[PDB]
Write a protein that binds this ligand. Sequence first.
Ligand SMILES: *C(=O)OCCCCCCCCCC
Ligand SMILES: *C(=O)OCCCCCCCCCC
Lengths: 330, 329
Amino acid sequence: MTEIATTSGARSVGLLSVGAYRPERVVTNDEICQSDEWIYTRTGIKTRRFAADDESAASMATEACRRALSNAGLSAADIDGVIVTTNTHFLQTPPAAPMVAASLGAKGILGFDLSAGCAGFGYALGAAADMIRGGGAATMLVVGTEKLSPTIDMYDRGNCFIFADGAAAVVVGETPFQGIGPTVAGSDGEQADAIRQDIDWITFAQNPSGPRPFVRLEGPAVFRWAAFKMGDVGRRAMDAAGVRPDQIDVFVPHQANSRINELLVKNLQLRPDAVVANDIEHTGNTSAASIPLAMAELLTTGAAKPGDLALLIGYGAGLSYAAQVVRMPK
Amino acid sequence: MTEIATTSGARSVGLLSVGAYRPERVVTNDEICSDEWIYTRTGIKTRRFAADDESAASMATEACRRALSNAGLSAADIDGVIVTTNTHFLQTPPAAPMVAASLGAKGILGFDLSAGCAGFGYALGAAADMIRGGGAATMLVVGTEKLSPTIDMYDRGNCFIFADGAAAVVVGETPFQGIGPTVAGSDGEQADAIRQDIDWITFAQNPSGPRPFVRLEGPAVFRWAAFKMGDVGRRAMDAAGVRPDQIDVFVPHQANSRINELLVKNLQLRPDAVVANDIEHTGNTSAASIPLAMAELLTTGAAKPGDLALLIGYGAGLSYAAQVVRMPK
Ligand SMILES: *C(=O)OCCCCCCCCCC
Ligand SMILES: *C(=O)OCCCCCCCCCC
């Protein structure tokens, strides 16, 4: 017999940088609601950004990657691979990743698209770290990108003010100390219909002049699942990384709803002075992009500092969750 | 001052089994279209089309069941599932949690990976990487495809190529290393070579225009695969510390027989190396093609468990992913 060779990579892996792209167009509650107080009270959202018509999930991802590279002090030549996590790449094929790689001037590098609803970022982060420690790569881009605005039913009074557009990217590479803890993840396939495209594209393709697909949300069900189950997920993620709740400096949950996230902060028993991501206020829910965008906002404003111990929790569609403890990038 | 735990799982990981699902309905060249014309160009004689109530997700579930059974394991033994596909026709929810739920392991981690036909290679790599990192001990990786609804029956360039099916592998700890290092890359400059021609949203906003279909720039894909994947193969063998002459089984993506015939020669394998030819009765099932081709070779007994196999996935995005594995089941 011949033994199949095993390779090895870096032991200590971390977030070198974050780079964010936010579309120019600002849509206020008052503009979209044709009550600002009503929306803000229920969601925590005041405004959100909508991408232009010529912008796409891939194009915003590219801009975000450019910015992440600059913040890590790297060129595209330094990158070994790129994972795009998104739910709004509106082509079955080709994937976004190779297009992103090409736009960045690194056309040959490995990459794929990963879809796990709002939790794809934690999954892609975990995969990158695993890949780098495995020896399959040394430095990687992970980019959450989302163009949700064309998917919104503007007569759906349950969700139309929730979803928004944007992209943010992290660079994952070797660090002097461990910077990304073990990935804690799971799902609940039994509640798959809680967040969905209501009509599959093929059913629609065969009757284009009938009702078209839009995003649908069973809000109460999602609220209850997130608010009550994600505490245990955070604890698992902290326990795996060997850290206590009181050691957490920064909490970055998925920016789905402020009320959900306030309940999680309380459930997680964090320090009274722990810094909690609240990017949703002017960014809305940008799904796969929300955590890294929220990371960027905290670093941009000086609320968080690079090296801060952060707990990230992603939750959402499919009913999927992914969580991990990290050190803040940049 | 605050340590983030450094961990690890099993260093030696491998394929414990493969399970295949193929739809009942056999469509012949004669039914679809000239038998000799298609066969000369592609090596396809027949292909399988899934029923209307079948999906990529449902077929993935069935492929997983069989894989589990072939490994002598149940859903309880699995820590996660990766579904790779290009024909999950929902933006959300992802297929993976639905497959987990249908297996009776609704709580397990999982996600959808899309990378054209190279998705299996990437997902295999990712699954092994995850296990060695300690994030899981045993995983399912399933390639699945319902390609028939995407075919334009008037596209005389490709209508006879694509078909339906699913196959899954169980990935877990093995006594000896069973999955070589991932060799992967892409060429985004040739993104339009294999594509959905009209994006779903553009189509939704103009229902009076044409509907989307799979489009293929054959020549451009042929050239790229036939002359570039040889080197990819060599890089994957080199990474696994194996010579071409040690390869028992070669499993390229079942895109086209003629491409694959040129690849076999370029790769300089043993005259008696076994070459996957599942395309003949399965057609091109994209992401499902490689595990399906593995299962076909094991079923006929052309390949045996333990055999040293070279896998090369190539296709859309212009993406490729390759590794050397030991044959499972
Ligand atoms: C996080 O859980 O958010 C999920 C949002 C993804 C919705 C995808 C859009 C589906 C509708 C397509 C018209
Ligand atoms: C392997 O390279 O396969 C790529 C083919 C995937 C085709 C997806 C279908 C796109 C058309 C949707 C109507």
